[PDB]
């Protein structure tokens, strides 16, 4: 047994060391198991909410004061806007004005410490966030894709028809391309979209948003990656096919915002004389006049 010990004692020590390492790793994972409160449940009844709830889509914001975290200064404050069904209204401006922030103000992506937003009938402070974003839509500035197929890229579920898939492809000017593809919207998008171009991927994202029959949603300067010809054709087709729908448009191209019902200009942390396009361009006093004149 002395031989036994002389043999196995050193293994005992070495295994103590190695398991110390492994348990330190386990403790690391566990210290990560501590997670912050996301607050999915909103203090509102789902029974009080009808199924096709966001019917009209009238939106009235007031004194909406947001900030990403509590430590950071408020990024958008003292803003008010009653938005009717208003088939297409526009928001634009220079960078950093908080337009993407305000886009994320709907989905409660931001801490919104002061103020509130009313979707028709109700605030934002009480919905279940899952229910919240389930019944709306958005087109991110950047295109982000999914390793899989067009079926899976558009439909995480399967609760859709290929007819509507081809429809969304067409109204986004993709079906024409896809016809040339041998997959039959069954090819493989590899690693976030390394097969297609920047604008191609942005188009895919647009269409994916377009899969939803939602009549109210928003876009974050989606056309920035898109060239002029497809820009015109796409904005026309989406305005027509969404003649009923209420879309809020961020535009890194004011030439696209010249068509919306209302134009919303953000300078630093609020709107400066949101109005119809014709009035703002003929008054010249708004800085959007300079925005459209520098382009011409």
């Amino acid at each position: 047994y002395a031989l036994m010990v002389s043999n196995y004692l050193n293994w005992m020590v070495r295994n103590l060391a190695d398991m110390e390492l492994q348990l330190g790793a386990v403790k690391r994972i566990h210290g990560l198991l501590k997670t912050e409160a996301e607050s999915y449940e909103g203090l509102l009844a789902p029974s009080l909410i009808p199924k096709n709830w966001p019917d009209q889509g009238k939106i009235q914001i007031q004194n909406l004061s947001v900030r990403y975290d509590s430590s950071l200064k408020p990024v958008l404050k003292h803003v008010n806007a009653l938005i009717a069904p208003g088939q297409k209204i526009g928001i634009c401006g220079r960078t950093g004005s908080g337009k993407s922030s305000f886009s994320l103000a709907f989905f409660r992506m931001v801490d919104t410490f002061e103020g509130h937003i009313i979707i028709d009938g109700i605030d934002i402070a009480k919905l279940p966030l899952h229910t919240l974003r389930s019944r709306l839509s958005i087109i991110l500035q950047d295109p982000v894709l999914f390793s899989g197929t067009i079926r899976f890229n558009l439909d995480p579920e399967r609760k859709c028809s290929d007819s509507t898939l081809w429809e969304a492809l067409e109204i986004a000017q993709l079906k024409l391309v896809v016809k040339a593809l041998p997959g039959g919207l069954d090819a493989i998008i590899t690693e976030g979209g390394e097969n297609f171009s920047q604008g191609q991927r942005q188009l895919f994202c647009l269409a994916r948003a377009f899969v939803r029959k939602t009549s109210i949603f928003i876009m974050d300067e989606a056309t920035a990656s898109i060239d002029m010809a497809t820009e015109n054709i796409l904005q026309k087709v989406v305005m027509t096919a969404f003649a009923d729908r209420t879309v809020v448009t961020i535009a890194h191209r004011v030439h696209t915002i010249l068509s919306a019902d209302l134009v919303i200009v953000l300078k630093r942390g609020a709107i400066l004389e949101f109005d119809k396009p014709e009035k703002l361009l003929s008054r010249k006093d708004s800085v959007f006049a300079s925005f459209v004149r520098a382009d011409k």
């Binding site: 220079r94 960078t95 500035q141 950047d142 391309v177 297609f196 171009s197 920047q198 604008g199 191609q200 188009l203 920035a224 990656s225 898109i226 060239d227 002029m228 010809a229 497809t230 015109n232 890194h252 004011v254 030439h255 925005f291 520098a294 382009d295 011409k296």
Partner: protein, 229 residues
């Protein structure tokens, strides 16, 4: 006379269809040229191909290779200092350094950084808007000091303020350099009277080239460019 192709054929995979077919290229030295077209038309692919990347089925590609400056169609970055990835292993030049930065007009965004210039950024460093990402990518080729400079969609992220300021300051500085040939592409056509040479392509095939006289022969393409005016 510089980098050019005679009847270029190019493809991503040799088993599939040839990406580029019968493309003929020419860029004069010390000239600012642009390449425009449709989305997915094949504009970045021709460029990557000119960078030895794409499997050419056929064609001859004559050069002067050189340490061609480059900014990808999407911004990329290293996991190192703002100054680090901007320098990209070059002899640090305060003059050239701040000149490039004020060209990209990144100084306000550098002030807002916790460590300003010596801020470690990246997948390990701190995240930031793709606008700064794009401006830094452009600065990579700007401060690169390379003879043949190259850009891919440096304007997508930026708004018109920063686009104008960048192109004016930086591109006018490039054309202000003696023979620092710089090639790019764009999604807006307003600076097309500011381009020297032009390449037009659609669906993976060149269409036209030539600044003023070669354009005016097209009523269709030039009315298309005139749709925005």
């Amino acid at each position: 006379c510089c980098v050019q192709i005679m009847g270029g054929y190019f493809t991503w995979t040799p088993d599939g269809i040839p990406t580029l077919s019968n493309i003929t290229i020419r860029i004069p030295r010390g000239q600012l040229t642009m390449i425009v077209g449709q989305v997915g038309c094949g504009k970045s692919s021709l460029l990557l191909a000119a960078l030895g990347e794409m499997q050419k089925v056929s064609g001859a590609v004559f050069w002067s290779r050189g340490p061609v400056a480059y900014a990808s169609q999407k911004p990329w970055l290293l996991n190192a200092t703002v100054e680090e990835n901007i320098i990209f292993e070059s002899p640090f030049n305060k003059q050239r350094y701040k000149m490039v930065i004020e060209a990209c007009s990144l100084q306000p965004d550098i002030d807002i950084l916790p460590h300003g210039d010596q801020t470690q950024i990246g997948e390990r460093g701190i995240n930031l808007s793709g606008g700064q990402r794009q401006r830094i990518s452009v600065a990579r080729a700007l401060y690169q000091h390379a003879n043949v400079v190259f850009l891919d969609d440096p304007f997508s992220a930026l708004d018109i303020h920063l686009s104008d300021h960048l192109m004016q300051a930086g591109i006018l500085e490039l054309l202000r350099d003696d023979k620092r040939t710089v090639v790019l592409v764009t999604h807006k056509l307003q600076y097309l009277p500011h381009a020297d040479w032009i390449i037009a392509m659609k669906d993976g095939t060149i269409q036209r080239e030539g600044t003023l006289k070669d354009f005016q022969r097209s009523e269709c393409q030039l009315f298309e460019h005139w749709k925005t005016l």
